Design a protein around this ligand. Structure first.
Ligand SMILES: [Ca+2]
Ligand SMILES: [Ca+2]
Ligand SMILES: [Ca+2]
Ligand SMILES: [Ca+2]
Ligand SMILES: [Ca+2]
Ligand SMILES: [Ca+2]
Ligand SMILES: [Ca+2]
Ligand SMILES: [Ca+2]
Ligand SMILES: [Ca+2]
Ligand SMILES: [Ca+2]
Ligand SMILES: [Ca+2]
Ligand SMILES: [Ca+2]
Ligand SMILES: [Ca+2]
Ligand SMILES: [Ca+2]
Ligand SMILES: [Ca+2]
Ligand SMILES: [Ca+2]
Ligand SMILES: [Zn+2]
Ligand SMILES: [Zn+2]
Ligand SMILES: [Zn+2]
Ligand SMILES: [Zn+2]
Lengths: 100, 313, 326, 100, 313, 326, 100, 100
């Protein structure tokens, strides 16, 4: 549920960047790949993550496994919004995302 | 007022449906086909009825929903049409625009077929219901219409946008008719003052098809909880210092510029149309003319009030 | 030749589907939506694949197939398109127009998207296959095209009709392009001479959608078995006489005319019945764009009217202020 | 399977003719009743019944009952075509229908 | 002023050419193809030059010519272009827009190709000539241009109309750009004051084609002699009584109505398109918007002068 | 097969016409305008008929004809269209595409107007005639159509190329529709098998214009005589040796590369040369209509700017009048 | 040259009216057919004849003969304009045409 | 008729090469002169002269003289093709051109 290790993963963002980006780097900074993760999952194009974008970021199939229940996803997203969001806008900004 | 985006009562693309074939936090029933980029509530077949409702109920007194939709037809006449519901319970099936009759709440109807015969369709009709009344299907609910409007929302070049705001016991419906791709381009359609609705209810959308046939696609649905500026409670001592925020944001912007440079260099490294661009330019020019005339109207209002104040001296 | 209507390999409205929501004697898979009047093999959403195949195998050496369909799009480009198959096995799902590749039989592809880039599509392509030859999806099967026929079958006012006749090892495809309500207006499209197809196989229809989106509806599908012109047993013993035929057809005609007369006075007896036009459910894409452009000019007219009213009001206010000074 | 009592039923065709023709007069002649039965089930216009029209004429959705299986329906229609159709055209004409 | 239509110096359809293949009272030379409904002065082939001039010379001091033409090209660049001449003698051949250089008179040039490179083409250039000067072909005659204008007259939906008026030693060029089918819809383009031209001369038109190629069609050419209202001489005692004129005209109108009835009855007795009608409606709506804004400008000028007069008190 | 270029039955640019204004070895009649680069067989005026025919008769049993042409119109409908003939006599003038009726030979008609009303044109129709059969002008020759091929050849960015091959009594018509600058991109259009044509006849091209108007230009016309694949006399005695061939082709290549190098430094030596683009001389009819509609909106913008300037002026005047009062 | 007998011709206006009008009258008044002649030759559609329209009306081929010289046509049209036209507009109106 | 003195003429090809190449140096080699003659008259690009290119190469419009008749031109080109062309392709190649 948006763990520090899940965000700080060098290969998940590399797998996302395939096709759109043809630049396989050797090794990147944890903050660099975290910024890449933040930019990748903002589908709407507004630099403002919300609950739906986080739900897409957490429960996408990749490449078999049982999907997570809706209650667990609701609890995880509610916890993320409660902990990280501070302006109570319903959106997660990178200023609010910098904590984790 | 202040708006908080509620994810539990909203859906949008481009990942609208998951691998299970169900919209997250929503339940669809009928002929609705939830796709990955839109929900086809009722396709262009004969006698189609579809509904998509929230699984959980809402818990806010002032709210606002932004609904993006398309109603595309093979002909110049339409089906029964669309409806956006704030009800007390999920009907999910019925003869009123694909949803149940005898509801308790508000329903904004987008009617495409003129059953009454007054040549006043397609139209937007706000209908409230305390729980016990039958919707006059053959008269477009003209008797029960708390308010009414008249906009054409079919076969437009761009998606039609609707903003429905329940604030201070007043319901306001503002519609971007779909001639411009701008998201915030709403124009006033209808308003009901001093209307009482249940304090908790289900948000839903539904669409129905009759003798003719239109495709009723819903591209997005976003629900915002509205709180008054006076009622907004401040919660300090939780945010980080503004200097740290600026230090974060400057390198955020620098790194997004670097990302844009990388994207461009490896889009050019690794290998619209005429007429469509011309049509887009035509519609942009029409929108520019409309905006310039609106500015002229504002300037005329300014000189009008200036002359009134000069006369009042 | 002589043609016999084979009902077990055919479907047709206006009662296409039963109470179970399935086409009788046919099996549908994918995103196909069978309705009571047509089968929407692939709807107008992104990446839709649909197929309807015969449950039982056909054993006619000389056959005729009449397919009535519509391919309707909001734009000027289709997405993937349609396919009529006479295979030996049911493809179900796959990348070849919503059906599996490496088929053993004949397949008539109604391609509406030009993958190769020669701007020759939409076109009807007759392709035969033995089982091991693949189909080049990105080249529209131009190398394997036994017979191509450049016909535009999208967004027509009337349903497009196709007649595929396999007779004496000749496959003739004749297409009514759907400009007239007349059913029997088949114009020549293509012909393949001396083609060998499997002796027994399944009939099928399939459709697919890609990046763009079209509605691929099939209103009817009629299969006729054709017998040899001279190798037909007459068997006149079952026929009774011409006297009973003469005693029956004229009372049938009398019943028809009496029913017409008995229906006419009550058709106008209840005037609550309402009708709809026919031209209003057809408009070309360019005509629709021009009508949208004309529709977008009403806002400018209304705003100019508001400006004129406000300017007249300020002019009258200025005149009344001048009068007040004097 | 196209029984003599099935075609000679007043209530069935009275239910069908409701709405389209508002003339319930009295008991009808058997030949008139059979003519109405033949004309009402030809949903196209060709004065020619076939297998699909017969399948619609057998498995009604009238106002419960289990749907007839495919095999029994196929056997019934094949028997009707074998007994009544004589020109082997695949259609049943009124001259062919009047025998049974 | 008063206008008298001179038939000897005019041509128009729909019977422009006679059986002899020659335009009456006009002489054509070059690649000009006089047809029955227009004159193609220079077709869309490479290096085409054509001229059509009057056989006789004009004998009026104040005049006016209305020229209807089309310049249609396969591309967005044009040929050398058109020219309307009032000269002293028929050149009929030459390198200046298909007509002779070193002329004595006035020439209104419709240039479609920018030889100078100032991105000021297509344009309308009035050039006078006393008899001895060379037209700067590679600079569009910018140095010799008495006046200039800038209108686009190529590939318009409707024919482009031009009115050139020589009145009181002033030459005025007004152009209907061709967005409306109205004949009298001219807009001001250019004006030259105190210009002297020969008292008698030939009226001509010419067109030339270069590396690219446009079709230069002339649909009509009407020449009106203009006389001053003060100089207009009255000639009474020749006309018939006004009562007889009314008696004639009432039955003229009655008989033309009867003719219309007969035409309709035997058009229905004896036995445009979608999109084209839609385009015509689009252009009509644009013209309506333009006319309404012009009316608003007139009203604003009215209130402006009213406020100025009020201030002057 | 082996193909030999017959110059006496051909014409090309960029010197198509001599100083006398006539096409060498060809005779032109009607409203045909021969230019130095193309022959405008029928210009874009009303009721134009034009023909260019070979002066001498051809005597090839197996031949090939390559025709490069453009049919350009200001609208979406053509007028009458083009025709390529291999007759026995010169038609000159007549009602059949600007040439006389009742011809004895083959005629490939490029029809751009739908006279019959089935909305199947533009189309290419192969019609043979023996001398007594008329041509139905008001039915597009549908009854006499030996082979029809629905191809749109009007308003294309590149010239349309047609290859008509009469070989072994088979007439194959293959058409490059003119979407690419590549010359050798011939796609199949139609084929007539076992057709008898006169043993010797005149080649010809003709065009006609009706109520509407198209420009019918022919840029080139190439006639090749085809010999039998095996019935070709080798005659190797006239060939000298491969040694002289090797002494010649390499000095030809050396001359070519030396000329390129000797031209490159003076191509940039004089920078007064100017060039033109290629896409700018092509625009679709619907795209042109939309561009005209967009062009018509500039007047509204200019008038609104004038209105805004005048309203600002009157606002400043009102403010200065208020200041003057105070 | 616009003689009284030339204007008063039933068969000429009948030949002009073929195809556009399918009403062959038996006999018409001289003023009736004169009005028909005036309405027929106004090609522009303004009820105002001029020199060019008269030139078309005089020298059209019908159904061979040497065409009239330009000088004779100029003289005839100038005479018609001098005699009939009174407002000096250059146009011939039916009020001015009623004299002949 | 493609004479040896005609191809071996400096003034002719000097007139042709004016404008396209601004390099008049000196007297050229006969083989270079012949190569320039062959290359300048192939108005298309195929390195292949034919009858039409030869007809243009014979009847110049240089700066008078009567135009050559069709029969003499036909005879000249037919003689050139009969003598020089050896593969019977209808074209004249540089190997075929170098013989004469
Ligand atoms: Ca976002
Ligand atoms: Ca936030
Ligand atoms: Ca309704
Ligand atoms: Ca209504
Ligand atoms: Ca394809
Ligand atoms: Ca293709
Ligand atoms: Ca039937
Ligand atoms: Ca039968
Ligand atoms: Ca110029
Ligand atoms: Ca310039
Ligand atoms: Ca035709
Ligand atoms: Ca046709
Ligand atoms: Ca007139
Ligand atoms: Ca007058
Ligand atoms: Ca060559
Ligand atoms: Ca050779
Ligand atoms: Zn992932
Ligand atoms: Zn029943
Ligand atoms: Zn006459
Ligand atoms: Zn030379």
């Amino acid at each position: 549920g948006l763990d520090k290790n899940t965000v700080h993963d060098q290969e998940h963002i590399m797998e996302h960047l395939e096709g759109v980006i043809n630049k396989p780097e050797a090794e990147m900074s944890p903050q660099e790949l975290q910024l890449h993760y933040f930019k990748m999952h903002d589908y709407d194009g507004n630099n403002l993550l919300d609950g739906l974008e986080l739900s897409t970021a957490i429960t996408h199939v990749h490449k078999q496994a049982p999907l997570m229940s809706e209650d667990e996803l609701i609890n995880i997203i509610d916890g993320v919004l409660r902990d990280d969001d501070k302006n109570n806008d319903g959106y997660i900004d990178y200023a609010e995302f910098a904590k984790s | 007022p202040h708006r908080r985006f509620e994810y539990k009562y909203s859906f949008k693309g481009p990942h609208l449906v998951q691998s299970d074939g169900t919209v997250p936090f929503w339940a669809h029933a009928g002929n609705a086909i939830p796709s990955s980029d839109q929900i086809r509530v009722a396709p262009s077949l004969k006698s189609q009825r579809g509904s998509v409702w929230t699984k959980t109920k809402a818990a806010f007194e002032n709210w606002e929903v932004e609904v993006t939709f398309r109603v595309t037809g093979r002909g110049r006449i339409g089906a029964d049409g669309l409806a956006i519901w704030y009800a007390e319970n999920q009907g999910l099936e019925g003869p009123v625009f694909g949803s149940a009759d005898l509801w308790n709440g508000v329903g904004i109807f987008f009617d495409s077929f003129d059953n009454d015969g007054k040549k006043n369709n397609p139209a937007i009709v706000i209908i409230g219901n305390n729980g016990q009344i039958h919707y006059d299907h053959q008269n477009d609910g003209a008797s029960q219409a708390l308010a009414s409007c008249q906009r054409d929302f079919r076969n437009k070049p761009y998606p039609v946008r609707a903003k429905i705001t329940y604030y201070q016991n007043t319901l306001t419906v503002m519609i971007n008719n779909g001639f411009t791709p701008d998201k915030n381009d709403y124009e006033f359609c209808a308003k009901v003052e001093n209307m009482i609705i249940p304090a908790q209810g289900h948000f839903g959308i539904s669409a129905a098809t009759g003798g003719l046939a239109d495709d009723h696609d819903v591209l997005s649905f976003l629900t915002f909880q509205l709180t008054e500026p006076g009622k907004e409670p401040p919660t300090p001592d939780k945010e980080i210092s503004e200097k740290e925020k600026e230090k974060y944001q400057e390198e955020f912007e620098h790194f997004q510029q670097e990302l844009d440079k990388k994207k461009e260099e490896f889009q050019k490294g690794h290998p619209e149309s005429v007429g469509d661009r011309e049509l887009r330019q035509v519609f942009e020019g029409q929108n520019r003319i409309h905006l310039e005339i609106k500015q002229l109207n504002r300037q005329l209002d300014m000189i009008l009030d200036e002359q009134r104040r000069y006369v009042s001296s």
